[PDB]
Amino acid sequence: GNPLVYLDVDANGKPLGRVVLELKADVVPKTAENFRALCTGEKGFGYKGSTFHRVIPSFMCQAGDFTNHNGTGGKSIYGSRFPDENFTLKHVGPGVLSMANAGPNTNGSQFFICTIKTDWLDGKHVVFGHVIEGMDVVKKIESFGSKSGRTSKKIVITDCGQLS
Amino acid sequence: GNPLVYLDVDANGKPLGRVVLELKADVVPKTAENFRALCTGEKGFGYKGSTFHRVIPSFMCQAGDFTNHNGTGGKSIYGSRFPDENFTLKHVGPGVLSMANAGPNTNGSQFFICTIKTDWLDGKHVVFGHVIEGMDVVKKIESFGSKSGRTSKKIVITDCGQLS
Amino acid sequence: GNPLVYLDVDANGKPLGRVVLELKADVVPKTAENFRALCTGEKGFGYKGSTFHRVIPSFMCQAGDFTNHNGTGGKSIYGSRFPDENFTLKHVGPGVLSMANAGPNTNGSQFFICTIKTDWLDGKHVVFGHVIEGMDVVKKIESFGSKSGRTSKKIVITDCGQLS
C-alpha cells in the first residue's frame, strides 16, 4: 500500500502536533520513495531536525532544506536532483503535498504543503501526497508565516518517520 | 562510539576539576567533530588556554573564544562559520552542550553548557552533546558567574582533549 | 545643552515612530559624542539602515551593529573600541540608554535601551542617555523580542540624526 509518514513540528520549542501524510506511491512511486526515505533517515540524511524555512499564509508551508536551512539546499536519495515523474496529481486544495523546485527536473528534498488550492502550480510542481491527519497542525505552521515567507516563530521538525 | 572529551578548568589558577562530555556524533557528526578537534587541538588551534568568558547563574556557562577571548570571535575547523547542522537535540536540562552563535548558520567555536532547561533556545542553537561526568565542576564554574555574565574569577580551560 | 538625537524605527517595513534620546554629554562627553556622531552619520558611517538585532522582553532592546547586523560588529568614531568613560550614571529603570560591550573597555557602536531597571549592569556598562520621547516605541520594539533575543519582525532604524 501507499506509505504513511509523519512530521512532528515545534514552534519556538513548543509542540504544534503531528502531521500524517499519505504518499501516493501508486501514482508517483519514485517521488514517494524519496520523501519516504527522507522521513526515515535510512540513507543517513533526512528531514529530522530541519525547519519550515518559508511559510506564506493563504499559500503554502515549505520545508526540506536539511543541508542549508535557507531554501538553496537539500538533496534526494537519487542524487542532488531527479526528474519530474509525472503531473497526474493536482494541487486541489489544502493539505496537498508537492515538490519544490527550480523549474523542470530539479526535484531534491524540498517540499511544500498547500493551505489553499493552487491550480497555478499544476504541471509545474510534482504532487505526490496529501495530509490525512493533522491539517490543524499545518494551519498552525501557516499562522506564523508572512508575505515575505519569513516566519515569526522558528518552525522545527522535531521528529519524523514512516508508520508501518 | 560517540567521542568523549574532557575540559580541565581552573579558577584564578586553582583547579576546579574535569568535565567529561559525550559528543552526539550519531546525531550531529559535523558539529561534534568540530568540538572534538578543538579539544585535541589537532588542527593547530583549539580550546586549550581559552576561558569561560560569560557565566550566568541559572542559565549557562559559555566558553570557546580562543581568538578574541571576549565572545566576539572563535573559528571552526571548517572556516570562520558553518551552518546549523540540525535541531534534532533539545536543551532538555542541566549539562546540555550547545553552540553559541550570532544568528542562523553562524557556528564557530564558542559553546555553552546549560545549567537549567532552556527550551526557549530550542531551534536556535545546535545542541550536540552533554555532560556525563563533572557536572559538579560545571556548578563550580556557575558559582563564579553573575547576572551580567561577568565572572568574579578568571575561569580557564587549562587542558582539554579526547578520552579514548 | 545635552544633545537630543532620534531614531525612527520600522518593524517589517511599518513605521513604529520616533525614539528621542537625551545624551548625557555633561557626564560622559566622549561616549555621548560617539553616539551623536553615529546618529548623524557625519563620519561616513553610523546607525542609519541598521537593526535592533537582539530584543529581550522585560530586559532591553539592543542595536548598533552597523557593520555585521548580528551583534559581532560595529565600531566607534575613535576606533574599533574605546574605554569605559565612567560608571557615574546607573541603570535606574526603563528608558536608560547604555553601551553594549565585550568586557571592560570594549565600547564600539552597539547600545541598548532598558525596559526595566537593570542594576546588575551598574559598573559594567556605561550609561550615557535616556529616552525623553517614544518610550511607547521602545515598548513596541520590546514586544517583538523573545527570551532567545531573536525578534519576530525585522526592526530597522530607517532614519536617525541630531535634533539639538
Q: How many domains does chain C have?
A: 1
Cell 550531529 sits at which residue?
B28
Contacts of C53 in chain B (CB under 8 A): 103
Mutate to test the interface with B, among A45, A156, A160 (most CBs of B within 10 A): A156
Give me the domain span that covers residue A76. Answer: 1-164
The domain that contains C22 carries what CATH number? 2.40.100.10
User: Which of A10, A50, A69 shows the shortest C-beta gap to B104?
Assistant: A69
- The residue of chain C nearest to residue A153, with distances taken between CA atoms, is C152
According to DSSP, the β-strands at B4-11 and C54-56 are unpaired
The one-letter code for the residue type at A143 is S
Query: What are the backbone angles phi and psi of residue A23, rounded to the nearest 5°?
Result: -100, 125
User: Which of B83, B84, B123 shows the shortest C-beta gap to A13?
Assistant: B123
DSSP H or E segment with residue B33: helix B29-40
Cell 559581532 sits at which residue?
C72
- The residue of chain C nearest to residue B122, with distances taken between CA atoms, is C148
Interface touch B103/C150, C-beta < 8 Å: yes
Interface touch C153/A153, C-beta < 8 Å: no
**In chain A, positions 52-81, which contact chain B (CB-CB < 8 Å)?**
66-70
Contacts of A150 in chain C (CB under 8 A): 154
User: Which of A67, A68, A156 shows the shortest C-beta gap to B123?
Assistant: A156
Residue numbers followed by a gap, chain B, C–N over 2.5 Å: none
A153 interface with C at CB cutoff 8 Å: yes
DSSP state of B163: E
Contacts of C121 in chain B (CB under 8 A): 148
Way it was determined: X-ray
Mutate to test the interface with C, among B55, B121, B154, B155 (most CBs of C within 10 A): B121
SS (H, E, C) chain A: CCCEEEEEEEECCEEEEEEEEEECCCCCHHHHHHHHHHHHCCCCCCCCCCEEEEEECCCEEEECCCCCCCCCCCCECCECCECCCCCCCCCCCCCEEEECCCCCCCECCCEEEECCCCHHHCCCCCEEEEEEECHHHHHHHHHCCCCCCCCCCCEEEEEEEEEC
Dihedral of CA A18/A24/A30/A31: which sign? negative
Q: Does the active-site annotation cover C110?
A: no
Contacts of A13 in chain C (CB under 8 A): none
What is the Cα–Cα distance from A108 to A99, expressed in whole angstroms?
8
DSSP state of B142: H
* Residues of B classed as catalytic: 54, 59, 62, 101, 112, 121, 125
Query: What are the backbone angles phi and psi of residue B39, rounded to the nearest 5°?
Result: -75, -45
C153 interface with A at CB cutoff 8 Å: yes
What is the Cα–Cα distance from C112 to C147, expressed in whole angstroms?
16
The size of chain A, in residues, is 164
Q: Mapping DSSP to helix (H, G, I), strand (E, B) and coil, where does residue B39 land? A: helix
Residue A44 burial (CB < 10 Å; 0-12/13-18/19+)?
A: exposed
What string of DSSP letters covers C22-75?
EE-TTT-HHHHHHHHHHHHTTTS--STT-B--EEETTTEEEE--TTTSSSS---
What is the Cα–Cα distance from C49 to C154, expressed in whole angstroms?
12
Interface touch B87/A12, C-beta < 8 Å: no
Interface touch B124/C150, C-beta < 8 Å: yes
What is the Cα–Cα distance from C2 to B152, expressed in whole angstroms?
36
